[PDB]
Design a protein around this ligand. Structure first.
Ligand SMILES: CCCCCCCCCCCCCCCCCCCC(=O)O[C@H](COC(=O)CCCCCCCCCCCCCC)COP(=O)(O)OCCN
Ligand SMILES: CCCCCCCCCCCC
Ligand SMILES: CCCCCCCCCCCC
Lengths: 50, 50, 51
């Protein structure tokens, strides 16, 4: 709200917390070309020689 | 074992050889013969550090 | 005896391939071999040879 204006240190601390959490997130976060999109499939393979 | 006493071994009716199991796949790299693997990744994975 | 003969004459024997890997160089034939198939009609089951 508007009570952060009277307390700049509170806002700055919240900003620092956001930056720290963001850095901790980007340090350990999976990266991939695309996420899992196709519906899960199960494949059963059997071999009969000849 | 024959009546004459001669021993019939497998090598005398067949050719034994350290061959392959599945013979129907020929892999070649840049024309040269080779064999490779395909790493299909995992569901939760990091596409770079992996 | 009837059970054993039914087991023998009602099988799915895998014939194989008439020329397959590892095949000799200069080979131009690739076919499957059909030796036996499971019986399908009571008439065929009636002609199973017991003796
Ligand atoms: C959205 C906020 C709610 C709507 C506005 C209401 C007031 C919010 C805060 C505010 O400006 O109030 C000042 C301080 O808060 C107060 O005096 C009490 C604040 C009441 C709201 C509760 C806020 C805490 C919420 C914490 C949970 C949030 C989620 C956390 C993840 C009052 O002015 P003053 O105190 O200087 O006046 C008295 C001194 N004479
Ligand atoms: C942030 C929630 C919506 C806006 C709330 C405004 C509250 C009135 C002004 C502040 C009074 C202290
Ligand atoms: C005032 C804050 C309202 C937030 C409601 C979120 C469901």
């Amino acid at each position: 709200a508007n009570y952060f204006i009277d307390r700049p240190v509170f806002a700055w601390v919240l900003a620092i917390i956001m930056m720290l959490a963001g850095g901790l997130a980007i340090m350990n976060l999976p990266v991939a070309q695309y996420p899992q999109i196709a519906p899960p499939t199960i494949t059963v393979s059997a071999t009969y020689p000849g | 074992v024959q009546q004459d006493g001669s021993q019939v071994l497998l090598r005398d009716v067949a050719r034994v050889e350290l061959g392959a199991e599945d013979y129907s796949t020929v892999a070649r790299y840049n024309g040269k013969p080779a064999a490779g693997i395909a790493i299909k990744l995992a569901a939760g994975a990091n596409a770079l550090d992996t | 005896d009837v059970i054993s003969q039914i087991k023998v004459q009602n099988n799915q024997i895998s014939g194989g391939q008439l020329g397959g890997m590892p095949q000799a160089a200069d080979q131009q034939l690739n076919a499957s071999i059909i030796v036996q198939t499971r019986l399908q009609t009571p008439e065929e089951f009636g002609k199973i040879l017991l003796k």
